[PDB]
Amino acid sequence: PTPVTSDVAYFQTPSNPRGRAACVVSCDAYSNESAERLLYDHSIPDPAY
Amino acid sequence: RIQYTYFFPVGLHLPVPRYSTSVSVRGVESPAIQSTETWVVNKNNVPLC
Amino acid sequence: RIQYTYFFPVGLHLPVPRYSTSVSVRGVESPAIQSTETWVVNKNNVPLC
Amino acid sequence: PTLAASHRVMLDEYMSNKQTHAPVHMGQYLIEEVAPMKRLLKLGNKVVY
Amino acid sequence: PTLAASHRVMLDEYMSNKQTHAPVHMGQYLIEEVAPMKRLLKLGNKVVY
């Protein structure tokens, strides 16, 4: 389920079905708390946008 | 065998300053219309809703 | 590693005898509408406002 | 992403002309697919790769 | 300068035809970029070099 106001410009480019990018390869090795912070925390705007 | 994942919308809104770029479409453009389905093309090029 | 600068405006106001050239766009022709953002294409070809 | 079209009409614009196709119309849209395989889309007898 | 379209239409019209696009429409504009490097601009499947 998705709000009706989500932008269509997210949909032409390949990305995640959730609204946040989830590539953990960029993060530091063996850092689970920094990697969880990329997935979930919203003090940080997307690695995509 | 190689597996791919196919991301796909249905049923959005488009914001208040509505616009167009097509030269040749005569119909749908009224603001009271709302689209409740999206059309996908199969393996065998048969379009489905 | 060659380092180039770039510059672009946002939020201008075109003067009084407003002209046009294109034959496609149908939505944004009004005088009361003014742009408040500009769209810049990313490195990986993603339009950002 | 795959082929999406909120109406039947805008899927006809993608196969009449691929260059001068409009991605976003007033209420409706279209997503051109970006996939590692590029299929032959053939509806009718007009072929758009 | 960079690609700086004031509205979503102008950047969606520069993609469709590089030559005959309007650099200044009624209210909005577009800056085609003049850089020492040239790039490919894939917004979907349409390329503007």
Automatic annotation (TrEMBL), chains B, C:
Top-rank lineage group of the source organism: Viruses
Protein name: ORF25
Naturally occurring in which organism (per UniProt): Human herpesvirus 8
Lineage, top ranks: Viruses, Duplodnaviria, Heunggongvirae, Peploviricota, Herviviricetes
Gene that encodes the chain: ORF25
Residues of the full protein shown: 395 to 443 of 1376
TrEMBL record, chains D, E:
Stretches assigned to coiled coil: none
Domain of life: Viruses
Protein name: ORF25
Source organism (scientific name): Human herpesvirus 8 (HHV-8)
